[PDB]
Amino acid sequence: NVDWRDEPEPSACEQVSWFPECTTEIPDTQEMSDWMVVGKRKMIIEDETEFCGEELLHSVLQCKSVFDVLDGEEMRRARTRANPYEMIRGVFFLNRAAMKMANMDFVFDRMFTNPRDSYGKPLVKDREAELLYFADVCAGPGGFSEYVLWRKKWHAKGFGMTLKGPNDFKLEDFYSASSELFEPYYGDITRPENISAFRNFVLDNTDRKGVHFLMADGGFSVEGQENLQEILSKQLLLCQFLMALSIVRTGGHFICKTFDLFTPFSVGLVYLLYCCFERVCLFKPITSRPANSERYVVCKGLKVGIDDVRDYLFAVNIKLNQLRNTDSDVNLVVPLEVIKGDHEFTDYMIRSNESHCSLQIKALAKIHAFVQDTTLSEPRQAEIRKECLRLWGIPDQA
């Protein structure tokens, strides 16, 4: 009962929708002192409708479950044929995540590779021999980094922290290999002492300022429960937000991969970033698969005076470690009354969640149709690859 053919022409052109400007004051310790609420540990996605229509949520949940019955190889072939952006995904870089950063660096006015001061002037010229400093926190640190170092070469310096094991870095490209351009820190991001350690390492190597921007992956995949990833990844997402506030310099930026944002815990986390940055937006680039839940929290311009929020999240993480492996969990980090009190923030959140669900439903329907009719094709895949490379300034090579 879905019409996937009523969809706009696939394009290299992408539109960004930002949250409205926050005009409320950064919360302080006393204001947040009753904000963390502990409750029963819950994994029921179907009734997380504070920021999404119930009917729409159930529809998307329904499509995903039907779609998951499907055999993997068959569905993967169809999804390759159905995705208009399939052909950009693999090109040029050694790591697919590098093309995602390429995509998003372009979309956000090079704010990552060419950050600006308040007068709009470049902070980092090649001449000045001053470095672009960045951090990459993920299961295999190097993919996001591969793009940055390709673009800025020796004018950049990156710090890596791995989410998996000590040697799970991606130091294979000609630049990530040089410890002068990229320094892995020698693996549990949930341990407070590891957070502090990495924070100090980064502060000591950036003149106590912090990095110009942090690139993070705040979610992990699980087979057989796409719906549940938002909940399973909640502590990782908090720790990445906490890392942003710990190592990004004033006026700096933050980009974080996440999944669905239906839960008040997730939305509370976003609300906090929205309080701490000049501009925040939720964005799904064309280089991420249209049928999945992946999106990016993109934060522009860390404000002054965020230490209370940083300290607050640090306390929440400790509480999460305490509640781990018990029937209790932290269910809120900001009260609903506060989040819903900000009407413009809430309107954006609902519009973002619902738009994502509506598009995801169509993308899943399309794949199903491509499974049933293997002659269906997406003819402009090649033209779109070409236009994207040109637009984003990426060589048409390997």
PDB file of N, CA, C and O in Angstrom, residues 136-139 144 163 189 214-221 228-243 254-261 265-266 269 294-297:
ATOM      1  N   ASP A 136      38.870  11.700  15.543  1.00  0.00           N
ATOM      2  CA  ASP A 136      38.088  10.683  14.871  1.00  0.00           C
ATOM      3  C   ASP A 136      37.891   9.599  15.916  1.00  0.00           C
ATOM      4  O   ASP A 136      38.859   8.999  16.364  1.00  0.00           O
ATOM      5  N   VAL A 137      36.648   9.385  16.340  1.00  0.00           N
ATOM      6  CA  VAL A 137      36.340   8.372  17.354  1.00  0.00           C
ATOM      7  C   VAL A 137      35.341   7.357  16.796  1.00  0.00           C
ATOM      8  O   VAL A 137      34.201   7.711  16.501  1.00  0.00           O
ATOM      9  N   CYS A 138      35.775   6.114  16.602  1.00  0.00           N
ATOM     10  CA  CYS A 138      34.912   5.103  15.992  1.00  0.00           C
ATOM     11  C   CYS A 138      35.494   3.693  16.091  1.00  0.00           C
ATOM     12  O   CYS A 138      36.588   3.505  16.623  1.00  0.00           O
ATOM     13  N   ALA A 139      34.759   2.705  15.579  1.00  0.00           N
ATOM     14  CA  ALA A 139      35.212   1.319  15.658  1.00  0.00           C
ATOM     15  C   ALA A 139      36.488   1.065  14.845  1.00  0.00           C
ATOM     16  O   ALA A 139      37.357   0.322  15.294  1.00  0.00           O
ATOM     17  N   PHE A 144      37.005   8.261   8.298  1.00  0.00           N
ATOM     18  CA  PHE A 144      36.666   9.670   8.269  1.00  0.00           C
ATOM     19  C   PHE A 144      37.973  10.434   8.063  1.00  0.00           C
ATOM     20  O   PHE A 144      38.047  11.404   7.306  1.00  0.00           O
ATOM     21  N   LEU A 163      36.953   2.357  19.167  1.00  0.00           N
ATOM     22  CA  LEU A 163      35.866   1.829  19.974  1.00  0.00           C
ATOM     23  C   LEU A 163      36.030   0.319  20.180  1.00  0.00           C
ATOM     24  O   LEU A 163      35.537  -0.251  21.154  1.00  0.00           O
ATOM     25  N   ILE A 189      35.190   3.294  25.632  1.00  0.00           N
ATOM     26  CA  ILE A 189      34.862   4.705  25.751  1.00  0.00           C
ATOM     27  C   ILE A 189      33.913   4.993  26.921  1.00  0.00           C
ATOM     28  O   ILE A 189      33.750   6.146  27.315  1.00  0.00           O
ATOM     29  N   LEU A 214      35.364  17.318  15.773  1.00  0.00           N
ATOM     30  CA  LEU A 214      35.373  15.894  16.082  1.00  0.00           C
ATOM     31  C   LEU A 214      34.419  15.139  15.145  1.00  0.00           C
ATOM     32  O   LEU A 214      33.303  15.597  14.875  1.00  0.00           O
ATOM     33  N   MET A 215      34.889  14.007  14.627  1.00  0.00           N
ATOM     34  CA  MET A 215      34.072  13.112  13.826  1.00  0.00           C
ATOM     35  C   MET A 215      33.884  11.846  14.628  1.00  0.00           C
ATOM     36  O   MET A 215      34.867  11.220  15.043  1.00  0.00           O
ATOM     37  N   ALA A 216      32.626  11.476  14.858  1.00  0.00           N
ATOM     38  CA  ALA A 216      32.319  10.306  15.671  1.00  0.00           C
ATOM     39  C   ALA A 216      31.250   9.387  15.065  1.00  0.00           C
ATOM     40  O   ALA A 216      30.422   9.805  14.249  1.00  0.00           O
ATOM     41  N   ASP A 217      31.289   8.129  15.486  1.00  0.00           N
ATOM     42  CA  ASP A 217      30.238   7.169  15.175  1.00  0.00           C
ATOM     43  C   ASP A 217      29.561   6.786  16.482  1.00  0.00           C
ATOM     44  O   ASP A 217      30.135   6.072  17.309  1.00  0.00           O
ATOM     45  N   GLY A 218      28.344   7.274  16.673  1.00  0.00           N
ATOM     46  CA  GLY A 218      27.649   7.078  17.938  1.00  0.00           C
ATOM     47  C   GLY A 218      26.653   5.934  17.936  1.00  0.00           C
ATOM     48  O   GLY A 218      25.787   5.879  18.796  1.00  0.00           O
ATOM     49  N   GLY A 219      26.766   5.019  16.974  1.00  0.00           N
ATOM     50  CA  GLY A 219      25.882   3.867  16.930  1.00  0.00           C
ATOM     51  C   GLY A 219      26.586   2.610  16.461  1.00  0.00           C
ATOM     52  O   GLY A 219      27.578   2.685  15.739  1.00  0.00           O
ATOM     53  N   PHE A 220      26.100   1.450  16.889  1.00  0.00           N
ATOM     54  CA  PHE A 220      26.629   0.200  16.350  1.00  0.00           C
ATOM     55  C   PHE A 220      25.494  -0.680  15.842  1.00  0.00           C
ATOM     56  O   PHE A 220      24.364  -0.602  16.332  1.00  0.00           O
ATOM     57  N   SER A 221      25.796  -1.506  14.847  1.00  0.00           N
ATOM     58  CA  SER A 221      24.799  -2.343  14.207  1.00  0.00           C
ATOM     59  C   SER A 221      24.619  -3.664  14.926  1.00  0.00           C
ATOM     60  O   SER A 221      25.572  -4.225  15.456  1.00  0.00           O
ATOM     61  N   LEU A 228      15.908  -1.468  17.409  1.00  0.00           N
ATOM     62  CA  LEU A 228      16.455  -1.481  18.745  1.00  0.00           C
ATOM     63  C   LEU A 228      17.823  -0.815  18.838  1.00  0.00           C
ATOM     64  O   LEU A 228      18.323  -0.581  19.941  1.00  0.00           O
ATOM     65  N   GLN A 229      18.436  -0.524  17.697  1.00  0.00           N
ATOM     66  CA  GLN A 229      19.791   0.031  17.704  1.00  0.00           C
ATOM     67  C   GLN A 229      19.888   1.368  18.419  1.00  0.00           C
ATOM     68  O   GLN A 229      20.879   1.630  19.096  1.00  0.00           O
ATOM     69  N   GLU A 230      18.866   2.210  18.267  1.00  0.00           N
ATOM     70  CA  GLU A 230      18.829   3.482  18.963  1.00  0.00           C
ATOM     71  C   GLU A 230      18.972   3.249  20.460  1.00  0.00           C
ATOM     72  O   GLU A 230      19.756   3.911  21.129  1.00  0.00           O
ATOM     73  N   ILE A 231      18.231   2.279  20.980  1.00  0.00           N
ATOM     74  CA  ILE A 231      18.279   1.999  22.401  1.00  0.00           C
ATOM     75  C   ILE A 231      19.571   1.309  22.809  1.00  0.00           C
ATOM     76  O   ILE A 231      20.199   1.696  23.799  1.00  0.00           O
ATOM     77  N   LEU A 232      19.989   0.312  22.041  1.00  0.00           N
ATOM     78  CA  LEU A 232      21.232  -0.382  22.354  1.00  0.00           C
ATOM     79  C   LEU A 232      22.443   0.533  22.331  1.00  0.00           C
ATOM     80  O   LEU A 232      23.381   0.334  23.101  1.00  0.00           O
ATOM     81  N   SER A 233      22.402   1.555  21.475  1.00  0.00           N
ATOM     82  CA  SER A 233      23.539   2.458  21.298  1.00  0.00           C
ATOM     83  C   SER A 233      23.482   3.702  22.192  1.00  0.00           C
ATOM     84  O   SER A 233      24.309   4.595  22.039  1.00  0.00           O
ATOM     85  N   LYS A 234      22.514   3.777  23.107  1.00  0.00           N
ATOM     86  CA  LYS A 234      22.276   5.029  23.830  1.00  0.00           C
ATOM     87  C   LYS A 234      23.465   5.505  24.658  1.00  0.00           C
ATOM     88  O   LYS A 234      23.715   6.699  24.749  1.00  0.00           O
ATOM     89  N   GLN A 235      24.192   4.585  25.275  1.00  0.00           N
ATOM     90  CA  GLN A 235      25.326   5.002  26.075  1.00  0.00           C
ATOM     91  C   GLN A 235      26.490   5.433  25.185  1.00  0.00           C
ATOM     92  O   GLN A 235      27.186   6.393  25.503  1.00  0.00           O
ATOM     93  N   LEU A 236      26.700   4.730  24.078  1.00  0.00           N
ATOM     94  CA  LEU A 236      27.720   5.143  23.125  1.00  0.00           C
ATOM     95  C   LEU A 236      27.432   6.540  22.606  1.00  0.00           C
ATOM     96  O   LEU A 236      28.334   7.358  22.504  1.00  0.00           O
ATOM     97  N   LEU A 237      26.170   6.816  22.292  1.00  0.00           N
ATOM     98  CA  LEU A 237      25.791   8.128  21.775  1.00  0.00           C
ATOM     99  C   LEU A 237      26.048   9.216  22.822  1.00  0.00           C
ATOM    100  O   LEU A 237      26.593  10.259  22.515  1.00  0.00           O
ATOM    101  N   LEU A 238      25.671   8.957  24.062  1.00  0.00           N
ATOM    102  CA  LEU A 238      25.956   9.893  25.133  1.00  0.00           C
ATOM    103  C   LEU A 238      27.453  10.143  25.256  1.00  0.00           C
ATOM    104  O   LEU A 238      27.874  11.280  25.411  1.00  0.00           O
ATOM    105  N   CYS A 239      28.256   9.085  25.207  1.00  0.00           N
ATOM    106  CA  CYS A 239      29.698   9.245  25.385  1.00  0.00           C
ATOM    107  C   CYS A 239      30.327  10.078  24.277  1.00  0.00           C
ATOM    108  O   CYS A 239      31.266  10.822  24.525  1.00  0.00           O
ATOM    109  N   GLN A 240      29.780   9.986  23.066  1.00  0.00           N
ATOM    110  CA  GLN A 240      30.290  10.773  21.952  1.00  0.00           C
ATOM    111  C   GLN A 240      29.907  12.239  22.078  1.00  0.00           C
ATOM    112  O   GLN A 240      30.704  13.132  21.779  1.00  0.00           O
ATOM    113  N   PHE A 241      28.676  12.488  22.504  1.00  0.00           N
ATOM    114  CA  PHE A 241      28.259  13.842  22.792  1.00  0.00           C
ATOM    115  C   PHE A 241      29.149  14.394  23.924  1.00  0.00           C
ATOM    116  O   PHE A 241      29.600  15.539  23.882  1.00  0.00           O
ATOM    117  N   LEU A 242      29.417  13.565  24.922  1.00  0.00           N
ATOM    118  CA  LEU A 242      30.247  13.985  26.035  1.00  0.00           C
ATOM    119  C   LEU A 242      31.663  14.281  25.523  1.00  0.00           C
ATOM    120  O   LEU A 242      32.271  15.275  25.898  1.00  0.00           O
ATOM    121  N   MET A 243      32.164  13.442  24.629  1.00  0.00           N
ATOM    122  CA  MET A 243      33.477  13.678  24.043  1.00  0.00           C
ATOM    123  C   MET A 243      33.529  15.000  23.272  1.00  0.00           C
ATOM    124  O   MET A 243      34.499  15.748  23.384  1.00  0.00           O
ATOM    125  N   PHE A 254      31.194  19.450  15.287  1.00  0.00           N
ATOM    126  CA  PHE A 254      30.958  18.066  15.716  1.00  0.00           C
ATOM    127  C   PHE A 254      30.029  17.395  14.715  1.00  0.00           C
ATOM    128  O   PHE A 254      29.014  17.969  14.314  1.00  0.00           O
ATOM    129  N   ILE A 255      30.404  16.200  14.271  1.00  0.00           N
ATOM    130  CA  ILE A 255      29.548  15.428  13.382  1.00  0.00           C
ATOM    131  C   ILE A 255      29.489  14.012  13.918  1.00  0.00           C
ATOM    132  O   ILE A 255      30.517  13.393  14.195  1.00  0.00           O
ATOM    133  N   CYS A 256      28.275  13.516  14.143  1.00  0.00           N
ATOM    134  CA  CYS A 256      28.123  12.217  14.795  1.00  0.00           C
ATOM    135  C   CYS A 256      27.103  11.341  14.088  1.00  0.00           C
ATOM    136  O   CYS A 256      25.955  11.743  13.889  1.00  0.00           O
ATOM    137  N   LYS A 257      27.526  10.144  13.714  1.00  0.00           N
ATOM    138  CA  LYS A 257      26.593   9.160  13.182  1.00  0.00           C
ATOM    139  C   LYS A 257      25.667   8.631  14.283  1.00  0.00           C
ATOM    140  O   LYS A 257      26.115   8.306  15.382  1.00  0.00           O
ATOM    141  N   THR A 258      24.375   8.542  13.989  1.00  0.00           N
ATOM    142  CA  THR A 258      23.456   7.909  14.916  1.00  0.00           C
ATOM    143  C   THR A 258      22.370   7.143  14.140  1.00  0.00           C
ATOM    144  O   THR A 258      22.371   7.129  12.909  1.00  0.00           O
ATOM    145  N   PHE A 259      21.440   6.513  14.845  1.00  0.00           N
ATOM    146  CA  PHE A 259      20.296   5.902  14.179  1.00  0.00           C
ATOM    147  C   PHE A 259      19.038   6.699  14.449  1.00  0.00           C
ATOM    148  O   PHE A 259      19.037   7.925  14.323  1.00  0.00           O
ATOM    149  N   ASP A 260      17.963   6.011  14.818  1.00  0.00           N
ATOM    150  CA  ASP A 260      16.682   6.686  15.043  1.00  0.00           C
ATOM    151  C   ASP A 260      16.748   7.540  16.292  1.00  0.00           C
ATOM    152  O   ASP A 260      17.529   7.270  17.201  1.00  0.00           O
ATOM    153  N   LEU A 261      15.936   8.580  16.329  1.00  0.00           N
ATOM    154  CA  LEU A 261      15.913   9.477  17.473  1.00  0.00           C
ATOM    155  C   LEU A 261      14.463   9.642  17.949  1.00  0.00           C
ATOM    156  O   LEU A 261      13.914  10.740  17.946  1.00  0.00           O
ATOM    157  N   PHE A 265      15.365  10.000  25.651  1.00  0.00           N
ATOM    158  CA  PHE A 265      16.788  10.031  25.989  1.00  0.00           C
ATOM    159  C   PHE A 265      17.599  10.589  24.801  1.00  0.00           C
ATOM    160  O   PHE A 265      18.378  11.526  24.956  1.00  0.00           O
ATOM    161  N   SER A 266      17.390  10.031  23.613  1.00  0.00           N
ATOM    162  CA  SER A 266      18.066  10.519  22.411  1.00  0.00           C
ATOM    163  C   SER A 266      17.767  11.980  22.148  1.00  0.00           C
ATOM    164  O   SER A 266      18.665  12.759  21.893  1.00  0.00           O
ATOM    165  N   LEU A 269      19.462  14.350  24.565  1.00  0.00           N
ATOM    166  CA  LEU A 269      20.860  14.488  24.162  1.00  0.00           C
ATOM    167  C   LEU A 269      21.004  15.514  23.048  1.00  0.00           C
ATOM    168  O   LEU A 269      21.876  16.385  23.103  1.00  0.00           O
ATOM    169  N   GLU A 294      20.390   5.288   9.410  1.00  0.00           N
ATOM    170  CA  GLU A 294      21.574   6.103   9.630  1.00  0.00           C
ATOM    171  C   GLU A 294      21.334   7.581   9.322  1.00  0.00           C
ATOM    172  O   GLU A 294      20.763   7.935   8.291  1.00  0.00           O
ATOM    173  N   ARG A 295      21.753   8.441  10.241  1.00  0.00           N
ATOM    174  CA  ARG A 295      21.794   9.874   9.964  1.00  0.00           C
ATOM    175  C   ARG A 295      22.930  10.519  10.757  1.00  0.00           C
ATOM    176  O   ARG A 295      23.675   9.838  11.476  1.00  0.00           O
ATOM    177  N   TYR A 296      23.093  11.821  10.603  1.00  0.00           N
ATOM    178  CA  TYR A 296      24.196  12.509  11.258  1.00  0.00           C
ATOM    179  C   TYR A 296      23.700  13.707  12.034  1.00  0.00           C
ATOM    180  O   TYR A 296      22.893  14.503  11.531  1.00  0.00           O
ATOM    181  N   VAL A 297      24.152  13.804  13.275  1.00  0.00           N
ATOM    182  CA  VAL A 297      23.942  15.016  14.035  1.00  0.00           C
ATOM    183  C   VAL A 297      25.107  15.930  13.648  1.00  0.00           C
ATOM    184  O   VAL A 297      26.279  15.566  13.797  1.00  0.00           O
TER     185      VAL A 297
END
